[PDB]
Amino acid sequence: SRRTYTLTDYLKSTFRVKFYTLQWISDHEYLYKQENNILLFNAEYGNSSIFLENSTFDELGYSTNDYSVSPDRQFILFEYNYVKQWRHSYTASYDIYDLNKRQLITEERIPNNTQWITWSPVGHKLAYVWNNDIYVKNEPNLSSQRITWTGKENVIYNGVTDWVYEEEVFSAYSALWWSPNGTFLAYAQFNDTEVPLIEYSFYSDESLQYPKTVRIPYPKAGAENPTVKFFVVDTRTLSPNASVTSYQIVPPASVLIGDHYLCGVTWVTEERISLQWIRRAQNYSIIDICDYDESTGRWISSVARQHIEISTTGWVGRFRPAEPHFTSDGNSFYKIISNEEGYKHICHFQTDKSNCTFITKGAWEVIGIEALTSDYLYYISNEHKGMPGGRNLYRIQLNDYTKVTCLSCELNPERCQYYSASFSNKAKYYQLRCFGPGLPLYTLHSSSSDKELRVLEDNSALDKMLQDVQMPSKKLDVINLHGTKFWYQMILPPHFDKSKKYPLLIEVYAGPCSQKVDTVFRLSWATYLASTENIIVASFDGRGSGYQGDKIMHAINRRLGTFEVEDQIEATRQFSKMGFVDDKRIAIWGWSYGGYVTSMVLGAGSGVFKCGIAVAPVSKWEYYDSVYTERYMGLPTPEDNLDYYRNSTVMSRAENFKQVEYLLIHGTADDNVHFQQSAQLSKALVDAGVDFQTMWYTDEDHGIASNMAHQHIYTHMSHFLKQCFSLP
Amino acid sequence: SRRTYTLTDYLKSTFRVKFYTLQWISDHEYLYKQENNILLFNAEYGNSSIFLENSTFDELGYSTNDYSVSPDRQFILFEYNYVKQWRHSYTASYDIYDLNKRQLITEERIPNNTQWITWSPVGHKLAYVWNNDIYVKNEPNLSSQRITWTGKENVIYNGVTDWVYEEEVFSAYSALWWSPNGTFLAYAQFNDTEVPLIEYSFYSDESLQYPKTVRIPYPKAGAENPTVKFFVVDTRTLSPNASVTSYQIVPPASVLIGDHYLCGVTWVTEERISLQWIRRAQNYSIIDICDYDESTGRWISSVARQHIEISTTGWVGRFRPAEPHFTSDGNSFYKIISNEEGYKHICHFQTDKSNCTFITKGAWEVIGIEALTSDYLYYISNEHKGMPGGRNLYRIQLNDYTKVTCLSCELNPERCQYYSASFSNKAKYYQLRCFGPGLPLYTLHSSSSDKELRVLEDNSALDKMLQDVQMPSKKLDVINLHGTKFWYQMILPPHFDKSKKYPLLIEVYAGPCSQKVDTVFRLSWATYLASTENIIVASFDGRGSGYQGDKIMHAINRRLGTFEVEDQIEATRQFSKMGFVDDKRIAIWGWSYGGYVTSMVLGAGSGVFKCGIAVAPVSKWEYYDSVYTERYMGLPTPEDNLDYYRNSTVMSRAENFKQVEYLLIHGTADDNVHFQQSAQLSKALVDAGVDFQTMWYTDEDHGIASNMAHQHIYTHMSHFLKQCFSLP
Ligand SMILES: *[C@@H]1O[C@H](CO)[C@@H](O[C@@H]2O[C@H](CO)[C@@H](O[C@@H]3O[C@H](CO)[C@@H](O)[C@H](O)[C@@H]3O)[C@H](O)[C@H]2NC(C)=O)[C@H](O)[C@H]1NC(C)=O
Ligand SMILES: *[C@@H]1O[C@H](CO)[C@@H](O[C@@H]2O[C@H](CO)[C@@H](O)[C@H](O)[C@H]2NC(C)=O)[C@H](O)[C@H]1NC(C)=O
Ligand SMILES: *[C@@H]1O[C@H](CO)[C@@H](O[C@@H]2O[C@H](CO)[C@@H](O)[C@H](O)[C@H]2NC(C)=O)[C@H](O)[C@H]1NC(C)=O
Ligand SMILES: *[C@@H]1O[C@H](CO)[C@@H](O[C@@H]2O[C@H](CO)[C@@H](O)[C@H](O)[C@H]2NC(C)=O)[C@H](O)[C@H]1NC(C)=O
Ligand SMILES: *[C@](=O)([N][C]([C]([C])[C][C])C([O])=O)[C]1[C][C][C]N1C(=O)[C]([N])C([C])([C])[C]
Ligand SMILES: *[C@](=O)([N][C]([C]([C])[C][C])C([O])=O)[C]1[C][C][C]N1C(=O)[C]([N])C([C])([C])[C]
Ligand SMILES: *[C@@H]1O[C@H](CO)[C@@H](O)[C@H](O)[C@H]1NC(C)=O
Ligand SMILES: *[C@@H]1O[C@H](CO)[C@@H](O)[C@H](O)[C@H]1NC(C)=O
Ligand SMILES: *[C@@H]1O[C@H](CO)[C@@H](O)[C@H](O)[C@H]1NC(C)=O
Ligand SMILES: *[C@@H]1O[C@H](CO)[C@@H](O)[C@H](O)[C@H]1NC(C)=O
Ligand SMILES: *[C@@H]1O[C@H](CO)[C@@H](O)[C@H](O)[C@H]1NC(C)=O
Ligand SMILES: *[C@@H]1O[C@H](CO)[C@@H](O)[C@H](O)[C@H]1NC(C)=O
Ligand SMILES: *[C@@H]1O[C@H](CO)[C@@H](O)[C@H](O)[C@H]1NC(C)=O
Ligand SMILES: *[C@@H]1O[C@H](CO)[C@@H](O)[C@H](O)[C@H]1NC(C)=O
């Protein structure tokens, strides 16, 4: 032991962090690929069998990047030819393989460039999008049936979301919802017709003589937004000589009154669907439980079956209103909302009664509802030890909201404080995912006795390797800002010599409801900066950060770039007091919102930071998309919030950049935070006679994730810092 | 003690070089803008008189950008609202001012956004281009008369060149020619229909919410070219209810067979016009002298009046074929072409015969024909002292080609070695223009006595200032590369100590027919680098450079990126052995071609250069336009030259960049050398795993000439250099 975790170690993932991904297919069975083959595991016994031998894989075209077995287990989809688009969207090619005959369906095949596809909840029907249109195949070998015709590229989307619904509302490309029994197929249609286009250049491969102009309908703050239509389709009459039987469900008057967004779709029963709408302003949402009128095919609404959720201090939900979780019968539902105290907690609702009943209370928050049985509700909260940066699995007894137990809490207190969970079909079993502070740990549990059962993956191999390398230690602690207790974390160099004054790297994000301080174990660039370069890396969650009540999270409502920016400065200032830090060598970096914050900070003139790096930063909110931007800023109009839109640009702080060293980076093909943002920032700094460095990344997106590009930016950033800290 | 020439000195233009711009308006008078007044000087006795006083300009209400007095001196044209387009093109608004009633014309005014305007050669007639169509105004107060109706944006161009003809053929936006007495108005039409569009983003001013996308029909190597047509309009028939009587002159068959370019137009007499065409291949051009047939109104050609010019070792002319200069009768003309030995000299052509007789010869070249009378021919050449980097005015006796005088070689030998001239009508007088080695100096002379009438400007003011400051010296000399002597130049720091060792900076261009080594006086970025930073800045003209005959200039024919690149490396390799050069601190920088050569040099792996800076570099010839590129490289096909097109990209040498500090700089709005070029190059490097520094300049065009931008790039390059050279 005399070697340290290096940039190459981090760049090449020399140290492998293993995990264990399974797929429940029953209340007691899951599918797990091991050594390339799909094995069927029995949760109860641990004994397994073969479902699909590796070798059944005959590199069709390229290779199998994902599979999907149909619910009746008679078939299985093979995803290959993957071709990414946006964060979640992508096209692919599919093969349907008959498990009975263990054959490969060869007639009536799924198209090339398929946008989205999915089995029905039961059986093996198939719905898929292609060229913005919907298709249904009741039988793999049988011919498909075209559902929509309006499908137009960059104009009409049926079955899949457009750019803003993908990135800002559903965090999915998918906009298809099979009914529980497959009778109905729900979908949304998005109309981008009047949505302005962001246009940037994509240079493609060196062989391309002329660059290509990418054009995406992307609504910026205040611009015209796309419109939505919801339809429920009765797949029963789907026949080639029959038309399509579909009903359009509109939002309740209170929202149909103006621009809005469809943000949630939840089937309760085969004849009950739950629509979640929110206004453009996004501080007013509403759940509409619609009932199927057998005698007419209509889907009906009722004032009594509607539930309003609003915010006066900000926006509804974290990034969107929390989803409703209905009881089997569908007469009541449990959903997370804010207290009178402003804490995200579970409230029990009655399908047709407006009053709800919180079943959880506390100065902490429910992160999410994972499972619901006829007796119990399973959820995840950051309650344990009152530290918001941790997560745990809790079970509450429905007949007595006093009987609430914590399953993950004491399993491995030192190694596990951050969990997520996956439950079997009828919540009879569940896998616990431990992500830190110690090495990840995957285990299988039986809901009956919460018995350990077995350890799926302990990363024992990874633990071995790391005992030879000089790893940094990660500590989390609090500090007091204007009365409030806020959390921070510091990755400290090995053999920490307290007499020495270490340089400081503040890694920031600071976006609304963001959380940079947690107990998640990571092998990041910071690890390298501390293990090898003896640089201390810290992060701070202040006003604006989430998982700590609305009072904190909403602090920056309608005023982005203010309190979250300032709290980073005061937090750092406090830190610069600790004896082991060289207050004359403090840098700050961030990506996206972190790049914005970092910029605002450098241009703050606090004289606190010597240099910073902004990767793909927002620079002027009017340049960002309407759904996200407005959710926190409202409209950039003088009758509303124009003033705070203008005094929050980075450009407005240009003059102050003369006091520090700044590295501005940005992918030229960033559909998310358009390259423009940085182009406008640099031009401003140039007008201000301010010197600084830049690094553009040709054809890389918001992720700058291509192999060569990933390695480069981190290598570059690393020298800039060393250069800034006068390091060897 | 003394002061040095500082960066701020160069950027702010603290030391202003003065000059004298006059406009001959007759055989003995010339206009001159003094104190914003327009003075009319009489060259005979030097007495002046006011032509238009600044009073007039105070009264206009807009910043006058320029004016143009009608030949008959009755009207003056005022130009305002100048809006730059490409290197030469631009649009503007125009006022016509009456010089008698000294009243501004306000009836039937000239359109805004006028692309081109010109008075006829006599009288006060006008011709202008608006919306790609031509118009003619006989009188300033009467309505104009539309000539063409085909004007179409980005498609059809009447009276003005397209982008490629503008940048590469005419070095002018203008594409119309009045006959001597204004009888005919000839123009060219360009069809860009099938020319591909280069597209790129222009973010504009910070407040634009969506970047705009600029589309320019621009042909790249091998792509489809614009086509052209030439017409001669008989303006005598112009009249509201009359059609436009015009005639179309097509190139001779030898050029018509395939792709060609109109490259020269020269009126000879009212009835004789000279067109110069050249094949797309550019090693074959022809002059076609057409005569007006009074009986039918057409312009006839004849094989007798055709003159071919071809190059078997490379291309014709320097950046186009030289222009013919006709005698007053048009029965003969004089033009520069390569002689048997490969040196460009003047040949006397018989308008109706094919053989020509050389009136000049030697191992030097005539730069151009300046004036021509029935008795003498005046020209410029680098003959004096046998130094190509020098320019002098010579007069040759038309009746005895052995009798040649050098009118400016001895005037001020030590102070002046680089001259340019400007003769009056009939060449009775001429202003001499000395640009170095000493402070520029403007003088007037008589042609009959060759007496130095008077001094127009000697820059004594500048001289005064430079006295108190420590300027650098510019030594010029020679060396040998493969048995040939090439010239180089060095900008040495003050108190140059042959003893001490200095860091060297190679400033390079090295493009075909270029001359980076001359005796011109320049207050440049290099002046500060030597004066204040004591850095030696050297330039070298090796193979491919011009003004030294075709053997040197055509050496790189069809193989750009080879000898010229190689020669800079050998040259430097020698400079380093000179003892006053510190071989541990050598760098190279260039712009455009220089950026390309610079890049190829660093990619060579010569171990010679430590760091380098490329600005707006070409990186792959298939990315540059057709006219320029094909001229030296041919077509990028395998039946032709694709092989050399491929192994000559900067990307092909990326692997070697791992050994040098590189700085890539480009303006995102560069319409000449597209941003694409540096984007593909940065992409190659990232892939090869090369670290380097970058810098883009938002909305800056090929010259990165906006003010702040200009200051910013030099400031940025200075720190880079100094950082490379270990200079505080
Ligand atoms: C309009 O025209 C009048 C001339 O009739 C201009 O006045 C002249 O302006 C120049 C420039 O300032 C003066 O020259 C100065 O000379 C001194 C000599 O020591 C020199 O030190 C300065 O650097 C400068 O060159 C000139 O004397 C003056 N002559 C007159 C008539 O007073 C006037 O500037 C013009 N106004 C406009 C609209 O520009
Ligand atoms: C998408 O929305 C646009 C409106 O933005 C619809 O366009 C209108 O269509 C109607 C009938 O087709 C016309 O009468 C209007 O003149 C159109 N307005 C505009 C601005 O185009 C379009 O029909 C919608 N598309 C779908 C399939 O819903
Ligand atoms: C935009 O302007 C507002 C007010 O004009 C800024 O808010 C003020 O911030 C100072 C701290 O510097 C406080 O002392 C004031 O009380 C604040 N005023 C209000 C009305 O809250 C805000 O910080 C600016 N935002 C940005 C991005 O600079
Ligand atoms: C492209 O390839 C050609 C041919 O291989 C190169 O030319 C040769 O270069 C070698 C090595 O420098 C010389 O020794 C030969 O004399 C050259 N022969 C020929 C056929 O020219 C050329 O230099 C390459 N060009 C580039 C851009 O690297
Ligand atoms: C930026 O912050 N995006 C970041 C987020 C996702 C890091 C957690 C990134 O790297 O993609 C931008 C600017 C602020 C909003 N933002 C977004 O991309 C948003 N659409 C979210 C919801 C993805 C943050
Ligand atoms: C390059 O040379 N651009 C330079 C030239 C004009 C310096 C003399 C610049 O600063 O504009 C580019 C790339 C090679 C060809 N070139 C051109 O611009 C050419 N069209 C010429 C004919 C202007 C050199
Ligand atoms: C596990 O073993 C039991 C026999 O006790 C069997 O019924 C079951 O199918 C097995 N499960 C698998 C998939 O191995
Ligand atoms: C398939 O699984 C077997 C175990 O049964 C394993 O030995 C073999 O390596 C696997 N083949 C691969 C690598 O696809
Ligand atoms: C559906 O229409 C097609 C039209 O070609 C016809 O051939 C087919 O018989 C129809 N289906 C039935 C049997 O209704
Ligand atoms: C919702 O936000 C908008 C912001 O434009 C505001 O006008 C409206 O009053 C808000 N309503 C509530 C209940 O806060
Ligand atoms: C110069 O003086 C002569 C007098 O011989 C006169 O004819 C001429 O017009 C004058 N020109 C100017 C510029 O005053
Ligand atoms: C321009 O060229 C296109 C084909 O290249 C032709 O069809 C068109 O008619 C031409 N237009 C003119 C005005 O010459
Ligand atoms: C030109 O024609 C118009 C109508 O077409 C008429 O009013 C005018 O008088 C004519 N003028 C001439 C020059 O004949
Ligand atoms: C002119 O160029 C073409 C193609 O580049 C070539 O084939 C032809 O031989 C050249 N002509 C001369 C005089 O060399």
Side-chain angles (χ1 to χ4, degrees), chain A residues 209-210 213 218 623 679 690-691, chain B residues 199 206 210 218 221 698 712 716:
Chain A
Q209 220 193 193
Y210 287 81
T213 298
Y218 175 120
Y623 302 154
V690 178
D691 186 48
Chain B
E199 309 181 321
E206 191 191 303
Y210 284 79
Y218 174 123
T698 305
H712 199 283
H716 204 65

Side-chain angles (χ1 to χ4, degrees), chain A residues 471-522:
Chain A
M471 294 301 271
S473 102
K474 175 178 188 178
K475 171 179 291 179
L476 263 69
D477 205 342
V478 187
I479 58 167
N480 189 100
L481 285 188
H482 28 57
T484 303
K485 53 178 296 300
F486 291 111
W487 294 78
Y488 77 85
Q489 67 163 68
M490 289 195 300
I491 313 307
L492 306 188
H495 302 65
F496 195 63
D497 169 2
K498 289 143 159 292
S499 66
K500 172 185 186 171
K501 283 177 179 298
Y502 297 72
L504 233 195
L505 214 210
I506 295 306
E507 183 165 348
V508 53
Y509 183 64
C513 193
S514 63
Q515 179 169 78
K516 288 293 295 190
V517 192
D518 55 45
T519 53
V520 179
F521 171 79
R522 299 183 169 70

Side-chain angles (χ1 to χ4, degrees), chain A residues 35-37 54:
Chain A
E35 311 179 302
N36 189 224
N37 37 72
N54 61 42

Side-chain angles (χ1 to χ4, degrees), chain B residues 281 283-284 310-313 558 634 640:
Chain B
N283 58 354
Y284 182 109
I310 70 105
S311 176
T312 72
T313 68
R558 294 163 68 75
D640 199 333

Side-chain angles (χ1 to χ4, degrees), chain B residues 150 156 189 191 193-194 227 229:
Chain B
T150 51
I156 297 290
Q189 184 191 70
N191 197 328
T193 284
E194 287 172 281
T227 64
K229 298 186 176 195

Side-chain angles (χ1 to χ4, degrees), chain A residues 29 40-42 45 47-49:
Chain A
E29 304 168 302
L40 160 58
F41 284 88
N42 177 301
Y45 310 116
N47 68 304
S48 67
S49 71

Side-chain angles (χ1 to χ4, degrees), chain B residues 278-292:
Chain B
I278 184 174
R279 289 175 179 162
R280 183 177 172 148
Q282 295 187 81
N283 58 354
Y284 182 109
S285 69
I286 189 175
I287 281 177
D288 189 25
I289 301 169
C290 313
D291 302 311
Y292 185 68

